[PDB]
Amino acid sequence: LLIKIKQADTNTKVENVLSINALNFSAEFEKLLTYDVNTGLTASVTLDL
């Protein structure tokens, strides 16, 4: 996914939006910390690997 976002900058900003919010990139960060964004520090530890 890191390689894909560097090639996607040639044509479309929606390409850079479809990945990081709707598709796989927003979903992959949740498995280590599910809702850590509730504060400045990682809290509300619902899921922790």
């Binding site: 479309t12 929606v14 390409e15 479809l18 598709l23």
Partner: protein, 49 residues
């Protein structure tokens, strides 16, 4: 119904003409989006009539 002697293909189209235009050709166009990238499809099948 009169027999006539010709000598080349240019002699034939002078007195008799050419072929008949086909009536069974169809053209299809489709615009698609594949993960933010455009895709255009052109489909001309071979005529059955």
């Amino acid at each position: 119904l009169k027999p006539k002697r010709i000598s080349s293909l240019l002699d034939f189209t002078t007195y008799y003409g050419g072929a008949q235009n086909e009536q069974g050709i169809t053209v299809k166009l489709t615009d698609t989006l594949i993960e933010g990238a455009e895709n255009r499809t052109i489909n001309v099948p071979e005529p059955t009539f």
